[PDB]
Ligand binder design. Structure first.
Ligand SMILES: O=C(NCCSCc1ccc(Cl)cc1)c1ccco1
Length: 209
């Protein structure tokens, strides 16, 4: 069973702005997603201070980067707090509404796309390099769900029947044809060392076989 939802008009037209605007500094997408993973890991670590059973679904707090040249996908996995179904549909969209509005206001005042993280909507920078984004997430209080959107005004949510994750969030970036450079090991290392050197969690860059 697949449910189809519409983006709020503000989020939809920001996504099209990220897709259609000529902006060469696309590498910042990785910084925003890694930063999003770092925030989710901080959340579960803090909550586990007053409730250690919240780590029964996994005690390791880390970030994995998985390039796949055959599928043309780049996957960012974290063992953070994860997201519930209401997070995917209601809660985060409400936050992204006001954050998107403020971001596009600044973009006309001279700001550029790289400052998207200051408005809390850094996730949508994934569409600088991806034509489709899939989000697999598992929260301690909810089932495993699969969110997905190729922009165009809508997204889908379904119960995930794939590999159980224990806890956390998996962001799968189906890259554009001309953005295969972010599947190369040396390029990812250069971006991580440039924008995410001080992230307080281990970042493991998986090598292909
Ligand atoms: O994008 C939507 N839902 C899935 C969000 S998961 C990635 C994410 C996206 C934005 C932010 Cl600020 C944080 C995390 C949406 C939009 C309207 C209803 O839902």
């Amino acid at each position: 069973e697949v449910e189809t939802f519409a983006f709020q008009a503000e989020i939809a037209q920001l996504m099209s702005l990220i897709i259609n605007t000529f902006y060469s500094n696309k590498e910042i997408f990785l910084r925003e997603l890694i930063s999003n993973s770092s925030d989710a890991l901080d959340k579960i670590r803090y909550e586990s201070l007053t409730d250690p059973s919240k780590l029964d679904s996994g005690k390791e707090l880390h970030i994995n980067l998985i390039p796949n040249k055959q599928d043309r996908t780049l996957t960012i996995v974290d063992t953070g707090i994860g997201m519930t179904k209401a997070d995917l549909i209601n809660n985060l969209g409400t936050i992204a509404k006001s954050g998107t509005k403020a971001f596009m206001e600044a973009l006309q005042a001279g700001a550029d796309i790289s400052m998207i993280g200051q408005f809390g909507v850094g996730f949508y920078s994934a569409y600088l390099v991806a034509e489709k984004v899939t989000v697999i997430t598992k929260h301690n209080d909810d089932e495993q769900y699969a969110w997905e959107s190729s922009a165009g005004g809508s997204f889908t949510v379904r119960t995930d029947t794939g590999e159980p994750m224990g806890r956390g969030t998996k962001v799968i970036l189906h890259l554009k044809e001309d953005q295969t450079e972010y599947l190369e090991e040396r390029r990812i290392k250069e971006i991580v060392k440039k924008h995410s050197q001080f992230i307080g969690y281990p970042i493991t860059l998986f090598v292909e076989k």
